[PDB]
mmCIF file of C-alpha atoms and ligand atoms in Angstrom:
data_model
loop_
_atom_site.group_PDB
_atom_site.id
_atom_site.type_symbol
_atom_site.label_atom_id
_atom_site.label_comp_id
_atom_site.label_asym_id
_atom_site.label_seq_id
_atom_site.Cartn_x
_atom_site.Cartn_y
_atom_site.Cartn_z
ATOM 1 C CA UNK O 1 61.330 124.489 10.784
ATOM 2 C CA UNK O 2 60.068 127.991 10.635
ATOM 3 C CA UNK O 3 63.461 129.200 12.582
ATOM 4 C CA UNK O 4 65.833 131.160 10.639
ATOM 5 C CA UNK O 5 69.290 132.418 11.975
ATOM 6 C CA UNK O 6 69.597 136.099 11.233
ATOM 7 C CA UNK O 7 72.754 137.940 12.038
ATOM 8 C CA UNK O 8 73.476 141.560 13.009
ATOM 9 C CA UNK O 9 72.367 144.324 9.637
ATOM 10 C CA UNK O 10 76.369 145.099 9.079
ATOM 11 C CA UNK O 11 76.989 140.811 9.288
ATOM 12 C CA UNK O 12 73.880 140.437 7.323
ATOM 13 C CA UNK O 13 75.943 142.444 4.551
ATOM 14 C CA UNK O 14 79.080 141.453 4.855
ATOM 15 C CA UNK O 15 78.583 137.675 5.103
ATOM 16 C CA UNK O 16 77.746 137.924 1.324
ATOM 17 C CA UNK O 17 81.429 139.429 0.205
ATOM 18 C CA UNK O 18 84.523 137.093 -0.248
ATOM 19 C CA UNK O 19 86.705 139.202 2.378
ATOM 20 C CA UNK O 20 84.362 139.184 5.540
ATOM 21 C CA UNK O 21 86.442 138.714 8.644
ATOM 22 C CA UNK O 22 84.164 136.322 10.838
ATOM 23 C CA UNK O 23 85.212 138.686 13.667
ATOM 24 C CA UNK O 24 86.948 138.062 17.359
ATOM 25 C CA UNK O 25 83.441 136.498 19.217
ATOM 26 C CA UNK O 26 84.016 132.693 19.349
ATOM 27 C CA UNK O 27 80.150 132.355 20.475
ATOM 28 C CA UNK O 28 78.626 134.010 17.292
ATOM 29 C CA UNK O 29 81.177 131.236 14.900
ATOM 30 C CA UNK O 30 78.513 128.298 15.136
ATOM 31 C CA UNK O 31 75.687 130.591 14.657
ATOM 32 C CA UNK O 32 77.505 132.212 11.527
ATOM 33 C CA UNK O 33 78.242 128.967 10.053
ATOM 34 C CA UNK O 34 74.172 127.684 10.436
ATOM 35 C CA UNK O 35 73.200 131.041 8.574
ATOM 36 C CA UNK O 36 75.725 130.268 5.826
ATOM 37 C CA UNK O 37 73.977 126.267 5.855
ATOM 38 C CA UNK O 38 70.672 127.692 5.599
ATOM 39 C CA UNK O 39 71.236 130.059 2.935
ATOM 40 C CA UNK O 40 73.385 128.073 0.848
ATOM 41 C CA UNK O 41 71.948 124.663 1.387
ATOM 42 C CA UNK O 42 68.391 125.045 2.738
ATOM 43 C CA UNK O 43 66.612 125.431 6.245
ATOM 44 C CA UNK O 44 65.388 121.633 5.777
ATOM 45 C CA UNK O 45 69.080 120.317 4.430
ATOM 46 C CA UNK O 46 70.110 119.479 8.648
ATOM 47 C CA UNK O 47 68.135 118.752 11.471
ATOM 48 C CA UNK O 48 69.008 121.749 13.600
ATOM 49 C CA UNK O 49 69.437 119.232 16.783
ATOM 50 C CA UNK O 50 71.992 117.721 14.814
ATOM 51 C CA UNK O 51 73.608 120.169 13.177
ATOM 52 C CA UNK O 52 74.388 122.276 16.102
ATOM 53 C CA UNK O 53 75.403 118.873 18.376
ATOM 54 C CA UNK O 54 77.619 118.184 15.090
ATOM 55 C CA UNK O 55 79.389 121.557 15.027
ATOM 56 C CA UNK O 56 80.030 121.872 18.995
ATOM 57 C CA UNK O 57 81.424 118.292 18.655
ATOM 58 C CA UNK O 58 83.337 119.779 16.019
ATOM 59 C CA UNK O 59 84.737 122.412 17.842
ATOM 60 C CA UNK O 60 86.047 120.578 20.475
ATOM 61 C CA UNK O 61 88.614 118.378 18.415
ATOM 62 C CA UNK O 62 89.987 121.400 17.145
ATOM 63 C CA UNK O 63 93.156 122.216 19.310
ATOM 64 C CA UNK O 64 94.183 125.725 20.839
ATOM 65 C CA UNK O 65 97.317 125.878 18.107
ATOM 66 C CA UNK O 66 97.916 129.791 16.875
ATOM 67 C CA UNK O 67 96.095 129.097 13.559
ATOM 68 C CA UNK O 68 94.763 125.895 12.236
ATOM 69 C CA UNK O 69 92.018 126.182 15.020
ATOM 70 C CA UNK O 70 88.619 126.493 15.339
ATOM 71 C CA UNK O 71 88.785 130.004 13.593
ATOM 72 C CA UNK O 72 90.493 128.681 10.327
ATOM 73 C CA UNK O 73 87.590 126.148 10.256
ATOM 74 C CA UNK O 74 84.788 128.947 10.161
ATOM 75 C CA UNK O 75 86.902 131.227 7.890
ATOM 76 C CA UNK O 76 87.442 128.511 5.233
ATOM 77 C CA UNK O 77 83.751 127.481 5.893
ATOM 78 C CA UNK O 78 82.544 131.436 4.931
ATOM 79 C CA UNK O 79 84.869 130.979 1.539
ATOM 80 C CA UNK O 80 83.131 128.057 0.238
ATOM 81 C CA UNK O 81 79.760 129.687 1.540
ATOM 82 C CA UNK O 82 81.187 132.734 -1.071
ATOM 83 C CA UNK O 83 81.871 130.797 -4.177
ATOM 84 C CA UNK O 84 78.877 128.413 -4.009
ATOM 85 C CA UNK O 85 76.092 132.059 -3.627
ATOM 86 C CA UNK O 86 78.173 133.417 -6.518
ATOM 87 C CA UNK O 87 77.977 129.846 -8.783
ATOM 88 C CA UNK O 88 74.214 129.069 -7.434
ATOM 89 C CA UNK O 89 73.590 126.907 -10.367
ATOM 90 C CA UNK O 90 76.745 124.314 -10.721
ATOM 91 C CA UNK O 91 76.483 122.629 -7.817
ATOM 92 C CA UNK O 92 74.193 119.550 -6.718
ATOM 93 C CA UNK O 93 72.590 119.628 -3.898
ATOM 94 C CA UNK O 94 74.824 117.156 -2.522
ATOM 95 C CA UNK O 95 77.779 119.205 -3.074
ATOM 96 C CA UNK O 96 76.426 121.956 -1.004
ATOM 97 C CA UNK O 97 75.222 119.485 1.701
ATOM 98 C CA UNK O 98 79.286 118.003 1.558
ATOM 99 C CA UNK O 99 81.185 120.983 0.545
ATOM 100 C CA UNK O 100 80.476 123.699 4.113
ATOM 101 C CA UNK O 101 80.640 120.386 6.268
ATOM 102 C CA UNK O 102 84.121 119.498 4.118
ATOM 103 C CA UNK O 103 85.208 122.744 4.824
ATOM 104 C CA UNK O 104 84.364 123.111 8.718
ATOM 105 C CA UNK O 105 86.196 119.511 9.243
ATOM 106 C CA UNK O 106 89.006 119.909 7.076
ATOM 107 C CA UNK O 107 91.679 120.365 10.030
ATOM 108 C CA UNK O 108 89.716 118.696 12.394
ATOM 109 C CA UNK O 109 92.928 117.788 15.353
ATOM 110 C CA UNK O 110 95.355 119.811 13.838
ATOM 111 C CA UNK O 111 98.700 120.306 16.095
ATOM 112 C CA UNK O 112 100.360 122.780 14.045
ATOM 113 C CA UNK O 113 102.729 120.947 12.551
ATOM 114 C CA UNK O 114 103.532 119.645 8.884
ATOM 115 C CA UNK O 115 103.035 116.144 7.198
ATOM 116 C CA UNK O 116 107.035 116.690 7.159
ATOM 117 C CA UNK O 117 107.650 117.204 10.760
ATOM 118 C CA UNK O 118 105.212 113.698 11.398
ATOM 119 C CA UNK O 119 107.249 111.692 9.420
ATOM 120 C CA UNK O 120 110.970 113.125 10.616
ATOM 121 C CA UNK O 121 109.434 112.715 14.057
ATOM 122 C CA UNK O 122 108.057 109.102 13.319
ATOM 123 C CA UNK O 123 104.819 110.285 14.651
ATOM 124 C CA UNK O 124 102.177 106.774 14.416
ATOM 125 C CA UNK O 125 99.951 109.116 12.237
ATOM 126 C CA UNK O 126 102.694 108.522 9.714
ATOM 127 C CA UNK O 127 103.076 104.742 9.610
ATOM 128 C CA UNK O 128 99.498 104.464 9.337
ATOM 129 C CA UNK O 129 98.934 107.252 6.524
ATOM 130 C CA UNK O 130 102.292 107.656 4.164
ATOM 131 C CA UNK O 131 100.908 110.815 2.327
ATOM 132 C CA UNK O 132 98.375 113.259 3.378
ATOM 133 C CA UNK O 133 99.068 112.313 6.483
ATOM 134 C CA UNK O 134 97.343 115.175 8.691
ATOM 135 C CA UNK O 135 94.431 115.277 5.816
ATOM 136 C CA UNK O 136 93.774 111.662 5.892
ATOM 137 C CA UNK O 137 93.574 111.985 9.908
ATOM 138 C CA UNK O 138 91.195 114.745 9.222
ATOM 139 C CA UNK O 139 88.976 112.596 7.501
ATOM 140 C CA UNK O 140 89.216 109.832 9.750
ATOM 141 C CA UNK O 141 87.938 112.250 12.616
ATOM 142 C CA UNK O 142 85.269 113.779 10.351
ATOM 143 C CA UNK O 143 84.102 110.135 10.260
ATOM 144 C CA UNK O 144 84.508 109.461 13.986
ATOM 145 C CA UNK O 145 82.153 112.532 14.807
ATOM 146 C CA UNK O 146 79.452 111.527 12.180
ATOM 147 C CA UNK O 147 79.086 107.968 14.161
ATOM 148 C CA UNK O 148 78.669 110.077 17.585
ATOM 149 C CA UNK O 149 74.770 109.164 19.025
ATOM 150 C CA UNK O 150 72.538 111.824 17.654
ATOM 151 C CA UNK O 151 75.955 113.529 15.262
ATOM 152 C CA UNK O 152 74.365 111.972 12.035
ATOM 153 C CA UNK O 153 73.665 115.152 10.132
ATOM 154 C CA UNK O 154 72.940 112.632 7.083
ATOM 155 C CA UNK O 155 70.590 110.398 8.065
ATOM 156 C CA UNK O 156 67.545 111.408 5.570
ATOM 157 C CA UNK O 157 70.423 110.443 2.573
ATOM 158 C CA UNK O 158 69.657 106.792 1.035
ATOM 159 C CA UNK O 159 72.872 104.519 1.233
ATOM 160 C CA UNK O 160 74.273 105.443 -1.375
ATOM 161 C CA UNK O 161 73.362 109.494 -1.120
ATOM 162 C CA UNK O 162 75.374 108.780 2.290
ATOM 163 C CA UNK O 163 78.521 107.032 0.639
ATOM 164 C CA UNK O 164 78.177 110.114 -2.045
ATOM 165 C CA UNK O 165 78.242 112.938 0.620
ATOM 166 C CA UNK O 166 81.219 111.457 2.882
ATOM 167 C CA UNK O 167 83.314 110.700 -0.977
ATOM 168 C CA UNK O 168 82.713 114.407 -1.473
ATOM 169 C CA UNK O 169 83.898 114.939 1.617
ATOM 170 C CA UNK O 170 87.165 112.594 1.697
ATOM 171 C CA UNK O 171 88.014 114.105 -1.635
ATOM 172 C CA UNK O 172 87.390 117.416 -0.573
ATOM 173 C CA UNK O 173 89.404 116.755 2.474
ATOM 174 C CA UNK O 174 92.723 115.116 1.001
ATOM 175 C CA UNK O 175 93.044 118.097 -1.597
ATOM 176 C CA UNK O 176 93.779 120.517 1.373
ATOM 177 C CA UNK O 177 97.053 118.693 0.875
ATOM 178 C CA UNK O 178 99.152 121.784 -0.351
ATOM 179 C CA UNK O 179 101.568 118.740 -2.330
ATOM 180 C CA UNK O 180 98.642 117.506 -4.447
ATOM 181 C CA UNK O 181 97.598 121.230 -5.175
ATOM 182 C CA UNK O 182 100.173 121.850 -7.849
ATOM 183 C CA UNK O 183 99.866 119.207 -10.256
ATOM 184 C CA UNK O 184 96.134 119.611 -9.656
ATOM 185 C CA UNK O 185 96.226 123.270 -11.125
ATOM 186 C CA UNK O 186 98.444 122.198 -13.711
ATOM 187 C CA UNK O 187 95.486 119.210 -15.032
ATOM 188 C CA UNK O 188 92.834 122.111 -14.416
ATOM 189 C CA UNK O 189 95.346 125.014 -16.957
ATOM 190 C CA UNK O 190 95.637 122.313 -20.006
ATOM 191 C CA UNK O 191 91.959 120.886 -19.742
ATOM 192 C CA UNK O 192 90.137 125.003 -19.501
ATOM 193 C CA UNK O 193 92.883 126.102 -22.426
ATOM 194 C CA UNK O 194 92.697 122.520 -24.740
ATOM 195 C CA UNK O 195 88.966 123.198 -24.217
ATOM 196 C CA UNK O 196 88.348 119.550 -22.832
ATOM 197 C CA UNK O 197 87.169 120.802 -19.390
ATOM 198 C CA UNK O 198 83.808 119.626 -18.486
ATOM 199 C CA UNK O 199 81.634 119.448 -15.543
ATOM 200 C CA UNK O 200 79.828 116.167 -16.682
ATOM 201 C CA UNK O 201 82.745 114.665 -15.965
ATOM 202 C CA UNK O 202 82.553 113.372 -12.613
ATOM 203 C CA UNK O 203 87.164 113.283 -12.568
ATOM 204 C CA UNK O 204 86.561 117.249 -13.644
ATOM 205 C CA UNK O 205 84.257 118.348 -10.990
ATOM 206 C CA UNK O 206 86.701 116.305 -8.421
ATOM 207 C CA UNK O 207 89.504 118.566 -10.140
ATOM 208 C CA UNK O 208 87.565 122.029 -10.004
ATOM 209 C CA UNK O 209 86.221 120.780 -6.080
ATOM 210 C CA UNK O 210 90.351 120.414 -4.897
ATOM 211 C CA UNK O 211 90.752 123.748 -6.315
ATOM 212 C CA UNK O 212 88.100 125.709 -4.649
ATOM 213 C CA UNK O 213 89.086 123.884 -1.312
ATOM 214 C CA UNK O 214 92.501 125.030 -2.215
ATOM 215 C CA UNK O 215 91.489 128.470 -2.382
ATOM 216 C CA UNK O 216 89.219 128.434 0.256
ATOM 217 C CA UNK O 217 92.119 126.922 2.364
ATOM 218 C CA UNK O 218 94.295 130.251 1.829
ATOM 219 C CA UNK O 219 91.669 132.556 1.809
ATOM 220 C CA UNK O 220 93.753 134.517 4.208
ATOM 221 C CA UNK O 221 95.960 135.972 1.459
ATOM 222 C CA UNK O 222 92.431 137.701 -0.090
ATOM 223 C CA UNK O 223 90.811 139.659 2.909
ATOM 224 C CA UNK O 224 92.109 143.101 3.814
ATOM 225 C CA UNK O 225 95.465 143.965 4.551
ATOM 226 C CA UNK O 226 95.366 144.297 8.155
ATOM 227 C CA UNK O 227 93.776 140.860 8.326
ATOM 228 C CA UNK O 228 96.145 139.456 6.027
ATOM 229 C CA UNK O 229 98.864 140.594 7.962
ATOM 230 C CA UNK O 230 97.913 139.445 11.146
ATOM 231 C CA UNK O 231 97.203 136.166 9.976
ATOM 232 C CA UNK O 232 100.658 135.318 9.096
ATOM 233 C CA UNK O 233 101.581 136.371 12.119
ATOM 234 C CA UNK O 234 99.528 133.213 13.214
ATOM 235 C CA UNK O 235 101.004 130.934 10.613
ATOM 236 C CA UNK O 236 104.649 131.534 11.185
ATOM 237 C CA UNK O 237 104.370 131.313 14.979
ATOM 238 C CA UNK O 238 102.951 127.699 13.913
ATOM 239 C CA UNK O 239 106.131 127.443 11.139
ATOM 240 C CA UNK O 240 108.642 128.984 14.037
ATOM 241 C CA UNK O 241 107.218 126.342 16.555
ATOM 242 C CA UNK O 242 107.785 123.867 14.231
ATOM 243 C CA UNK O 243 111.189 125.212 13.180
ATOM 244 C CA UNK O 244 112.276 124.621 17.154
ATOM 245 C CA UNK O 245 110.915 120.858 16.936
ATOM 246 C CA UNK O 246 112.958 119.969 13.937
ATOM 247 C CA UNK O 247 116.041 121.674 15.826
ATOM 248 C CA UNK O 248 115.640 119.567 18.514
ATOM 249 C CA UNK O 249 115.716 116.174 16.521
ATOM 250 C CA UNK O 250 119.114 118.026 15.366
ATOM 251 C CA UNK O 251 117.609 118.947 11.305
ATOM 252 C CA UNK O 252 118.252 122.591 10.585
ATOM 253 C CA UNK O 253 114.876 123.685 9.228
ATOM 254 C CA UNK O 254 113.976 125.317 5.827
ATOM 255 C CA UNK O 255 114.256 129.618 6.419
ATOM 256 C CA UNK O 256 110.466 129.594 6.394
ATOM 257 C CA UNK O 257 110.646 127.655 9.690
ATOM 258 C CA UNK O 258 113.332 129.369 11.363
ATOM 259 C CA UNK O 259 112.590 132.074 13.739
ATOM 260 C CA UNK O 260 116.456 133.391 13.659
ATOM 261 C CA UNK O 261 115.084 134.043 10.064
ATOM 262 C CA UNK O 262 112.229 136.894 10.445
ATOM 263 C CA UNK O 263 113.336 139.055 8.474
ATOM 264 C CA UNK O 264 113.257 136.796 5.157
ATOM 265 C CA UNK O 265 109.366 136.697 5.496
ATOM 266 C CA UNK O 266 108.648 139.517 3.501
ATOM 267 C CA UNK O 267 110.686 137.660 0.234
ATOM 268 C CA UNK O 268 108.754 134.777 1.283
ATOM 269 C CA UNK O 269 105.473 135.968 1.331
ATOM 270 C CA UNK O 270 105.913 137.387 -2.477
ATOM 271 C CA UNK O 271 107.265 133.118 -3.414
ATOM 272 C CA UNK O 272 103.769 132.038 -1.589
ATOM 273 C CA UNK O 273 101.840 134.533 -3.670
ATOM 274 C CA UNK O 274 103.363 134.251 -6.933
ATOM 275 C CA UNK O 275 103.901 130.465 -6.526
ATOM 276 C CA UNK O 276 101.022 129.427 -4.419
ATOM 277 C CA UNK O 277 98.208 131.616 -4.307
ATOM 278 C CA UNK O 278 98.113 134.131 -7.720
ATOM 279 C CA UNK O 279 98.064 130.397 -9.583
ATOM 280 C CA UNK O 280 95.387 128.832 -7.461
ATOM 281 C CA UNK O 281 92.435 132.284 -7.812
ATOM 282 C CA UNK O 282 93.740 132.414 -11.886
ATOM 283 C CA UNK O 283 92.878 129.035 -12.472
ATOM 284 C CA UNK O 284 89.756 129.332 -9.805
ATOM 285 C CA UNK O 285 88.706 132.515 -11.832
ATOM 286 C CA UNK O 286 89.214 130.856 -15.343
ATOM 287 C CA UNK O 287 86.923 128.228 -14.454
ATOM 288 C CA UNK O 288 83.984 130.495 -11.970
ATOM 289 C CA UNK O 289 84.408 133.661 -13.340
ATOM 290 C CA UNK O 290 82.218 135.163 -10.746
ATOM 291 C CA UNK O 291 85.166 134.128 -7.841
ATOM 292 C CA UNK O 292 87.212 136.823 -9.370
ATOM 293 C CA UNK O 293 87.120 139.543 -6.446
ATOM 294 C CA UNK O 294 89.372 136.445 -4.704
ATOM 295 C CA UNK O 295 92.414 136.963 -7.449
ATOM 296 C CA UNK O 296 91.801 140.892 -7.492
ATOM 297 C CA UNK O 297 91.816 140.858 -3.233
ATOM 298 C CA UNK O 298 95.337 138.640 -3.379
ATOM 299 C CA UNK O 299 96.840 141.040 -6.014
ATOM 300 C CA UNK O 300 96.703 143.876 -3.744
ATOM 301 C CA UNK O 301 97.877 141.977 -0.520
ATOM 302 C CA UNK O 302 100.527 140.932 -2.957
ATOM 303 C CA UNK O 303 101.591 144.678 -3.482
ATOM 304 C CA UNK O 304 100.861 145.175 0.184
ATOM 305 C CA UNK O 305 104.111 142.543 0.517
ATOM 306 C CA UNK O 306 106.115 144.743 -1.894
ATOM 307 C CA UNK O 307 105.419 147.474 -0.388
ATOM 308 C CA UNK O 308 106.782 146.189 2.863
ATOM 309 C CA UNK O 309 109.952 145.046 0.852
ATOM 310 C CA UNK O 310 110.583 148.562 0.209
ATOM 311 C CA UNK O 311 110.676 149.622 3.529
ATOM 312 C CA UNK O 312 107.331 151.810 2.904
ATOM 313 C CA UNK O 313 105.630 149.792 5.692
HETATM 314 C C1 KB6 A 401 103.875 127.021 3.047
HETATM 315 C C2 KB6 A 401 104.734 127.829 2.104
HETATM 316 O O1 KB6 A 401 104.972 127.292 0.847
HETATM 317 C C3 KB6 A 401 105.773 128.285 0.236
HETATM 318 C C4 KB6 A 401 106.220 128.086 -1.147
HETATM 319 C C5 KB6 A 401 105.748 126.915 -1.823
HETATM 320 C C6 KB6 A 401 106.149 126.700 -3.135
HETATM 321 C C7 KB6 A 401 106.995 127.650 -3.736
HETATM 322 F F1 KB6 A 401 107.354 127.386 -4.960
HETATM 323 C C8 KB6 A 401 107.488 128.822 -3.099
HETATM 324 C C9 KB6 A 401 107.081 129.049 -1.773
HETATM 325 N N1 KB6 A 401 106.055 129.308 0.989
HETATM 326 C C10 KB6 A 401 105.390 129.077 2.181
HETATM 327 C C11 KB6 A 401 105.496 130.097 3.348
HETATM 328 C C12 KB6 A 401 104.208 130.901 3.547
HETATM 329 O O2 KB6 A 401 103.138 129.979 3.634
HETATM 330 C C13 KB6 A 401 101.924 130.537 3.737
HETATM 331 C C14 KB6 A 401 100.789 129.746 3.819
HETATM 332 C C15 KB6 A 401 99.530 130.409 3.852
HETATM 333 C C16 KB6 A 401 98.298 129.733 3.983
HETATM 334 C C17 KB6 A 401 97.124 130.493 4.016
HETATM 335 C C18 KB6 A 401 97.076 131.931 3.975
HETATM 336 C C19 KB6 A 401 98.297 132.574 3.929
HETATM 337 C C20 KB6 A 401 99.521 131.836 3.850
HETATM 338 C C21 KB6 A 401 100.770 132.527 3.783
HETATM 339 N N2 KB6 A 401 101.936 131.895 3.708
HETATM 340 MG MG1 MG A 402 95.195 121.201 6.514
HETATM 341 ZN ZN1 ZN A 403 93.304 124.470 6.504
#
């Protein structure tokens, strides 16, 4: 009880920012992520036993893929840890109990490939889940570890504290669903500018929840440049993979898929950003004003992009 984490002075630091990198030493990940739990949450929110049996179990049903692994998990994890320090007083405790744990689980079994390439594949994930397909399987493992001997990191919530949390967290969850992101920014831009958003409104705060874990999802567009850029270079070798897969059940793949089709990433990374990820931090910033060093870091990796364009990198 009277155990703290405490991390290295220049972690320490750095934690607290939006575009910390949670650095290339798997072994200090769980450690990070129980500092981030403590702080954000409380040193009595888990039972330490638990917690750390929960995240190793965790870890393991996260697969080896280039980038929806174990690294992704603890990167989206530190984003959510970001926005809820900088928004310390709109959140429940609940949230903050659901939101980290959300986040940490929300690729739990990834195998690098799309809800598209499941259902031209006929992969039995897709009969039994027709959309969200990977994000409903998430869930369904997220469950699975929680009902592990000894994994119940809940078990001081009443019933229906419990069935609270794990809604949070199936919400939470299922709006990592790029598809569902769009139309969910859309509701958020006419309820903030008609003036009819509110946060008593259980439907809102589900709204405003998708859209953090939307832009805690792609957080790798707001870190540094170098970061950014080697990133991608983890998410197309997933796309490229995939690309192959869909070649051999003879469907020629989308450009973003295609490895014959490197050199197009550039124009494609500008698309992402100006139809993906500049939307998501506006919106993000409209409604938590203090998330705005997320927008300003994804404006200038979206100039870094130009600048490639024009051959000046
Ligand atoms: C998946 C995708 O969707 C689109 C896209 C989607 C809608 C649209 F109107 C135009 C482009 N481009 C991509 C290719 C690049 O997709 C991504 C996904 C990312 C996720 C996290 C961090 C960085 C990322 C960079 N590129
Ligand atoms: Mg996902
Ligand atoms: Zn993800």
């Amino acid at each position: 009880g009277l155990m703290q984490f405490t991390l290295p002075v220049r972690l320490c630091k750095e934690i607290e920012l939006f575009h910390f990198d949670i650095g290339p030493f798997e072994n200090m990940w769980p450690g990070i992520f129980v500092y981030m739990v403590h702080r954000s949450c409380g040193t009595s929110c888990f039972e330490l036993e638990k917690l750390c049996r929960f995240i190793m179990s965790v870890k393991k049903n996260y697969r080896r893929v280039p980038y929806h692994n174990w690294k992704h998990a603890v990167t989206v994890a530190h984003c959510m840890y970001a926005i809820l320090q900088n928004n310390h007083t709109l959140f429940t405790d609940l949230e903050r109990k659901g939101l980290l744990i959300a986040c940490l689980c929300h690729d739990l079994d990834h195998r690098g490939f799309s809800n598209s390439y499941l259902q031209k594949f006929d992969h039995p994930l897709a009969a039994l889940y027709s959309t969200s397909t990977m994000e409903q399987h998430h869930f369904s493992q997220t469950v699975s570890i929680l009902q592990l001997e000894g994994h119940n990191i809940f078990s001081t919530l009443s019933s229906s504290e419990y069935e609270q949390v794990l809604e949070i967290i199936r919400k939470a969850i299922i709006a990592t669903d790029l598809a569902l992101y769009f139309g969910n920014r859309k509701q958020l831009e006419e309820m903030y500018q008609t003036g009819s958003l509110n946060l008593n409104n259980q439907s809102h705060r589900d709204r405003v929840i998708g859209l953090m874990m939307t832009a805690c999802d792609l957080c790798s567009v707001t870190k540094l440049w170098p970061v950014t850029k080697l990133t991608a270079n983890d998410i197309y070798a997933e796309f490229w993979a995939e690309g192959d897969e869909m070649k051999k059940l003879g469907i020629q793949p989308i450009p973003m898929m295609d490895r014959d089709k490197k050199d197009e990433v550039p124009q494609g990374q500008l698309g992402f950003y100006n139809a993906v990820a500049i939307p998501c931090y506006t919106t993000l910033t409209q409604i938590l004003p203090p998330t705005e060093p997320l927008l300003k870091a994804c404006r200038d990796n979206l100039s870094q992009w130009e600048k490639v364009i024009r051959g000046e990198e």
